[PDB]
Amino acid sequence: KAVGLRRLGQPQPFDYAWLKGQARALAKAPYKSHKQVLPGPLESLNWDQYQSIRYRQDHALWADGNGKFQAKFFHLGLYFHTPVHIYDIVDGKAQQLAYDPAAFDYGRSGLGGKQLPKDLGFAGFRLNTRKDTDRDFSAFLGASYFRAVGKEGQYGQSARGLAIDTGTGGPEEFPDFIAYYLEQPADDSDTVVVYGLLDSPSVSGAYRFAITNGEVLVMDIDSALYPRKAIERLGIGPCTSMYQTGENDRRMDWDWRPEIHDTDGLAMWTGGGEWIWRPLCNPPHLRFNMFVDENPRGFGLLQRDRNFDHYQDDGVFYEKRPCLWVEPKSGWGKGSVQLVEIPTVDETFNNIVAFWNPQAKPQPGQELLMGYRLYWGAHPPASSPLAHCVATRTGLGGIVGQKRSHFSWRFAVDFAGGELAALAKDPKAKVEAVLQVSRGTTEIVSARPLHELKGYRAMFDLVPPDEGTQQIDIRLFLRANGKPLTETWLYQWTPPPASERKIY
Amino acid sequence: KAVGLRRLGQPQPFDYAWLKGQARALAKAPYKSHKQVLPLNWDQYQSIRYRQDHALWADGNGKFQAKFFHLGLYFHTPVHIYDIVDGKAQQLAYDPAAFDYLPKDLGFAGFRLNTRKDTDRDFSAFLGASYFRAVGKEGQYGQSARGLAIDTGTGGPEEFPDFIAYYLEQPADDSDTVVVYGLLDSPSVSGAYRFAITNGEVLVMDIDSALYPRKAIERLGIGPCTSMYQTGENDRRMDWDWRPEIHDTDGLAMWTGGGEWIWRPLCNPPHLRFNMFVDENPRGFGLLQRDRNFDHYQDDGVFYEKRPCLWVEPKSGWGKGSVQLVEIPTVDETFNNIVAFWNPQAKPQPGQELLMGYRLYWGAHPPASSPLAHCVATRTGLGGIVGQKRSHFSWRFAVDFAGGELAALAKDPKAKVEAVLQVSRGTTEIVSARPLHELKGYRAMFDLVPPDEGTQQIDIRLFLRANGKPLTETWLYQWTPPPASERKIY
Ligand SMILES: OC[C@H]1O[C@@H](O[C@H]2[C@H](O[C@H]3[C@H](O[C@H]4[C@H](O[C@H]5[C@H](O[C@H]6[C@H](O[C@H]7[C@H](O[C@H]8[C@H](O[C@H]9[C@H](O[C@H]%10[C@H](O[C@H]%11[C@H](O[C@H]%12[C@H](O[C@H]%13[C@H](O[C@H]%14[C@H](O[C@H]%15[C@H](O[C@H]%16[C@H](O[C@H]%17[C@H](O[C@H]%18[C@H](O[C@H]%19[C@H](O[C@H]%20[C@H](O[C@H]%21[C@H](O[C@@H]%22[C@@H](O)[C@H](O)[C@@H](CO)O[C@H]%22O)O[C@H](CO)[C@@H](O)[C@@H]%21O)O[C@H](CO)[C@@H](O)[C@@H]%20O)O[C@H](CO)[C@@H](O)[C@@H]%19O)O[C@H](CO)[C@@H](O)[C@@H]%18O)O[C@H](CO)[C@@H](O)[C@@H]%17O)O[C@H](CO)[C@@H](O)[C@@H]%16O)O[C@H](CO)[C@@H](O)[C@@H]%15O)O[C@H](CO)[C@@H](O)[C@@H]%14O)O[C@H](CO)[C@@H](O)[C@@H]%13O)O[C@H](CO)[C@@H](O)[C@@H]%12O)O[C@H](CO)[C@@H](O)[C@@H]%11O)O[C@H](CO)[C@@H](O)[C@@H]%10O)O[C@H](CO)[C@@H](O)[C@@H]9O)O[C@H](CO)[C@@H](O)[C@@H]8O)O[C@H](CO)[C@@H](O)[C@@H]7O)O[C@H](CO)[C@@H](O)[C@@H]6O)O[C@H](CO)[C@@H](O)[C@@H]5O)O[C@H](CO)[C@@H](O)[C@@H]4O)O[C@H](CO)[C@@H](O)[C@@H]3O)O[C@H](CO)[C@@H](O)[C@@H]2O)[C@H](O)[C@@H](O)[C@@H]1O
Ligand SMILES: OC[C@H]1O[C@@H](O[C@H]2[C@H](O[C@H]3[C@H](O[C@H]4[C@H](O[C@H]5[C@H](O[C@H]6[C@H](O[C@H]7[C@H](O[C@H]8[C@H](O[C@H]9[C@H](O[C@H]%10[C@H](O[C@@H]%11[C@@H](O)[C@H](O)[C@@H](CO)O[C@H]%11O)O[C@H](CO)[C@@H](O)[C@@H]%10O)O[C@H](CO)[C@@H](O)[C@@H]9O)O[C@H](CO)[C@@H](O)[C@@H]8O)O[C@H](CO)[C@@H](O)[C@@H]7O)O[C@H](CO)[C@@H](O)[C@@H]6O)O[C@H](CO)[C@@H](O)[C@@H]5O)O[C@H](CO)[C@@H](O)[C@@H]4O)O[C@H](CO)[C@@H](O)[C@@H]3O)O[C@H](CO)[C@@H](O)[C@@H]2O)[C@H](O)[C@@H](O)[C@@H]1O
Ligand SMILES: OC[C@H]1O[C@@H](O[C@H]2[C@H](O[C@H]3[C@H](O[C@H]4[C@H](O[C@H]5[C@H](O[C@H]6[C@H](O[C@H]7[C@H](O[C@H]8[C@H](O[C@H]9[C@H](O[C@@H]%10[C@@H](O)[C@H](O)[C@@H](CO)O[C@H]%10O)O[C@H](CO)[C@@H](O)[C@@H]9O)O[C@H](CO)[C@@H](O)[C@@H]8O)O[C@H](CO)[C@@H](O)[C@@H]7O)O[C@H](CO)[C@@H](O)[C@@H]6O)O[C@H](CO)[C@@H](O)[C@@H]5O)O[C@H](CO)[C@@H](O)[C@@H]4O)O[C@H](CO)[C@@H](O)[C@@H]3O)O[C@H](CO)[C@@H](O)[C@@H]2O)[C@H](O)[C@@H](O)[C@@H]1O
């Protein structure tokens, strides 16, 4: 039977307006690092020691009550040298939770009998239903990172509170959540509300996360930001994923597993009403791309291929990993969805980052309010009502069985859904591939039924305009009678250098 | 309505003994070339179409007919075609009335056979040198057979026999079989063949051959299967194409005289590889297209997943010899870069008569396979624990098996299944055998550390075992390790 948790200090009145006040005040002073040298035995644990530490079910927050949820806490150490102070809100008042050795099984860490302060803090927290106390439906841990899962329960990509100067070629600035306030839900509530205080060299913030667990998990998020400095590249709603290899891009096809990625595309629903699918790549050099928009309806990183046959990893279940969809609340005005793709040689590094960059540079003293909903699960809650891109495949161009007189690259793009089944069965149906390329030229263009999918396949060869490796953008959709039949496929290709072209 | 075909000369008595007689006399005399200067793009060649009004047997009441290929393009060796009726052969003339666009004795390039019900579908086609093809139910042409291979994969020049005449025996009206006789000639050898062809879901050819060496032969190949393997999970060295699997066949299957079932995955190696599997009284061998899932191939024009498996079953005990496999590097699917055949231990000698009979099966599945679990996938890549510094180069293999009693073992937490793994050189590490529930089978994984910096072929033998007995056919993989320069990049 669970016990009450050890506390620190007395309850203090708490609400979102109060937290926005703390964050604004925090931005009025220069940034001071929150990283600490931890007490001696804690400062240099190894992986094995750290991993053996376990938070005890009998000290899980709220598990002594009658509600549907509970929380457990991650211990500091190993990677986590920035204390996070955790508070419980009851009747409108926030009480800090003490670091309590009785709440941990220390395993092989050697931490028992050390004299660790009551104000040590934590590394983060995780939430669990009371019906299923070993399953984490969300986990907030490290910097401003957090993750959640839907029904399938397999962890994959991450979100963050905020991204700053990702992919600039210069150094990235990583904000931290330095405090979390967990609001005790009503006994019959399906929601857990968590508040977060964020600080970073450039900016402070106050965050409210209303987390509703479900088959697709939803978080209703409000953020109030208070810059301390001008910010070159602010990133709202950042999604953080990994793409090593797959049909979209076989450059790093060194593995026996054919698809290795936590997500395979960036999806966008534009203010103008367009649906876009942008297949993720693993490029040879860092690539930064922006998609200009105004009042965006949504963007996110999806794991659209959910067929185990294409992944084959019965250890980590890539095909079950969640989509993450960002849905702006209200109008965010002008800006761009931005995508950073970093080269990676393996699947241990998150080489994909996507976020929203406002047009206007934030300025010291200003308040910036940004709200959105995040959906985690097998499918985003919104998608194109037209046919979706269900596969992208590429390879060396040129008519098979003829001499090849020049370098080109071949693309095959498969669409299914909407009304393509009926069109594919109509021998008179005329479907037009619509192609626009940033540079270079297309040849051997076709759009034809793909009966095996009850869909359509577009194929084209792309001839780069020169011997250089400047990125080439291709926009493709299918159409009939004044209406698009598909969402828009937007691919960004880094041509090979002349030396590689010569081998071909 | 179809008309009778233009003839040439008068019917002469014909039987198999006569044909054997013509072949042996051909072989005793000096070889005379049959390539002729004929009295043209690949696209431009098909303007020529043999017409149905002139199709052989289309004016009768039987189940089958023949039409003929025109000499041209890749075909400059005339084939004389004959119709056998009541024990008598009569040559068919070259007739311009029979084509849609030249002497009566110009000859043809070969023939194709059709049911009367589907006169545009051909279920067999004999065309080019001694090559021929057939299809089963799915109708999609793929790998080829030949009458004979000579000096394939020697590092010297190959010699390619020609069928120089075919005698088509008019079937009885209710027969399900077409019998075709072939006269083969080649610098080294002449032959008389009999092909009993029985169309069906899996098409069967019952073949008898009688071979007369004109001179000693260095490498005789009997029952040759000729295929293509560009890229796929077995070997992604040439992964240039958007299509992930490109091959007419994915493995060599062998049923040995001792009763072993072997699956040898085909590769597209960087240099020619010649491999032999010593056997005695082989029970069968062939090239299979075992992966039949369109999803893995994606070509909705030529349907690699529907192409036929070719299985050879000797009608008798062929004694000692070897199944031989030749793999040639290719950068495209148009080159036939895979050849497998039986090579008898004994060197053929001038004056001798070699009688060899066998059955060929063309269709979706071989008519025989292991009753144990099959290898249903081979995948390979860079070895080493993922995301760790590597002290040494290694290559990782994942091999999936399904069938036999593996589904029951996979569900059974008490089940003790072990991978048994031998390599001809180097060492193996990080070896496992575990249920693959998504398949209801097992997966074996291992890493292989090549012994040195060089690229000498390594042979790997794998099977799964419980209580001392095999649970699977034998997986036999021949790996060419990458050179040092490639390892540095890894
Ligand atoms: O083929 C191949 C070739 O090719 C070429 O190229 C080309 C190309 O082609 C390609 C393709 O293309 C395509 C195209 O495309 C396009 C696209 O399209 C798209 C689409 O769209 C479209 C649309 O469409 C539509 C449709 O409509 C259409 C129609 O249709 C129809 C159909 O019809 C068809 C037909 O059908 C039929 C069939 O059957 C048949 C068959 O056939 C087949 C074939 O076969 C062939 C072959 O092949 C093969 C091969 O193999 C072979 C061989 O050969 C080889 C050689 O051999 C030799 C030997 O060799 C040896 C060696 O020796 C040597 C040496 O070596 C050495 C060694 O030794 C050593 O060791 C080493 C060391 O190291 O060294 C070395 O060196 O050397 C020396 C030197 O010195 C030498 O001398 C020597 O020789 O050795 C070795 C070792 O030992 C060995 O192993 C070897 O062997 O030798 C010997 C002795 O001497 C000799 O004799 C031999 O010869 O070799 C050479 C060299 O290398 C090579 O090269 C060769 O190759 O031979 C042998 C013997 O004889 C044999 O046996 C074998 O087999 O190969 C492979 C492997 O590798 C295999 O696999 C194969 O198979 O070949 C031959 C020869 O040539 C011939 O004859 C034959 O024929 O094939 C195919 C393929 O695969 C298949 O498929 C088939 O099947 O045949 C038979 C006979 O046999 C007969 O009988 C039968 O009949 O099929 C079916 C099924 O099965 C059936 O049923 C039928 O019947 O067909 C045809 C043909 O193909 C076609 O054409 C047609 O089309 O039909 C159906 C039913 O009925 C119907 O329904 C339909 O309708 O049609 C029309 C008319 O035409 C049209 O017009 C129309 O279009 O429709 C459908 C339904 O509805 C729908 O869906 C659709 O859509 O349309 C529209 C309009 O409207 C349009 O616009 C449009 O476009 O669509 C789709 C869907 O969606 C898609 O997918 C597609 O894509 O498009 C695009 C745009 O967008 C474009 O761009 C494109 O182009 O198309 C077209 C029409 O369009 C087509 O035509 C074409 O095709 O493609 C593919 C892929 O995918 C590929 O693959 C191909 O290639 O094309 C182009 C264009 O046109 C052109 O230009 C040209 O050219 C190449 O050139 C060549 O090369 C080859 O050959
Ligand atoms: O493999 C498996 C398979 O089989 C099959 O069956 C088959 C068979 O096989 C078998 C084998 O056989 C062997 C033999 O043995 C036997 C014997 O024989 C005999 C004969 O008789 C026969 C007949 O004949 C005929 C002929 O024809 C031939 C040819 O001729 C040519 C010529 O030359 C000649 C030679 O031959 C001789 O020898 C000599 C003498 O002096 O003379 C000469 O002249 O030349 C010309 C010019 O150049 C030409 O034109 C011709 O063609 O040759 C070939 C090659 O060598 C041979 O083969 C043949 O035979 O012709 C003649 C005329 O000249 C006539 O008259 C005769 O008649 O035929 C029949 C049918 O028609 C049959 O039936 C019979 O048999 O005779 C001869 C004489 O002439 C003698 O010499 C011989 O010896 O017989 C016996 C009794 O009957 C028996 O028993 C045996 O068997 O031998 C041969 C020779 O040496 C060889 O070659 C063969 O191979 O045997 C084995 C045992 O070991 C077995 O196992 C097998 O089976 O064969 C047959 C024949 O060819 C056929 O017909 C059949 O078909 C089956 O069917 C399946 O199923 C299986 O799988
Ligand atoms: O963004 C979308 C989501 O919005 C959520 O709703 C939010 C709401 O966002 C609005 C936004 O609100 C802005 C605000 O305009 C309000 C106006 O505010 C007056 C305020 O009245 C509020 C009250 O304020 C208390 C005050 O807290 C403020 C805090 O004070 C500091 C204190 O914390 C500190 O200790 C000391 C010492 O350092 O300094 C003080 O300055 O400072 C922060 C940061 O600046 C402010 O955000 C806090 O308001 O503290 C004093 C004590 O010091 C209290 O006496 C006072 O009550 O708080 C109430 C909740 O407790 C709240 O309901 C009241 O609105 O009062 C101050 C004076 O005290 C006055 O100057 C503000 O103008 O209120 C009117 C209602 O009459 C609203 O119509 C108006 O929108 O202005 C502040 C200051 O500039 C902004 O920071 C704030 O963003 O306005 C947007 C329109 O432009 C609107 O679109 C947003 O929805 O903000 C409130 C307040 O922060 C939140 O409580 C609320 O949750 C929705 O719930 C989501 O669904 C949306 O997605």
Residue numbers in the entry:
A (entry chain A): 30 to 533
B (entry chain B): 30 to 68, 74 to 135, 145 to 533
Can I see the authors' text?
In this report, we discovered that XccOpgD, a GH186 homologue from X. campestris pv. campestris, alone converts linear β-1,2-glucan into CβG16α specifically. CβG16α is classified into osmo-regulated periplasmic glucans (OPGs). Structural analysis of XccOpgD revealed an unprecedented reaction mechanism, anomer-inverting transglycosylation, providing the new concept of the reaction mechanisms among GH enzymes.
Three glucan chains were observed in this structure. Two glucans have DPs of 11 and 10 and bind to sites distal from the catalytic pocket of XccOpgD. In the catalytic pockets of the dimer, the electron density of a linear β-1,2-glucan with DP22 was clearly observed only in Chain A (top), probably because the closure motion of the cleft around α-Helix 3 is inhibited by crystal packing in Chain B, implying that the closure motion of the region is needed for substrate recognition. In XccOpgD, the substrate is also observed from subsites −16 to −8. Subsite −16 is located near subsite −1, which appears to be suitable for cyclization. Consistently, electron densities at subsites +1 to +6 are obviously observed in the complex structure. In contrast, in XccOpgD, W76 in α-Helix 3 is likely to be important because this residue forms a stacking interaction with the Glc moiety at subsite −16, and this is consistent with the W76A mutant displaying no cyclization activity (<0.1% specific activity compared with wild-type XccOpgD). In XccOpgD, the 6-hydroxy group of the Glc moiety at subsite −16 is located near the anomeric carbon of the Glc moiety at subsite −1.
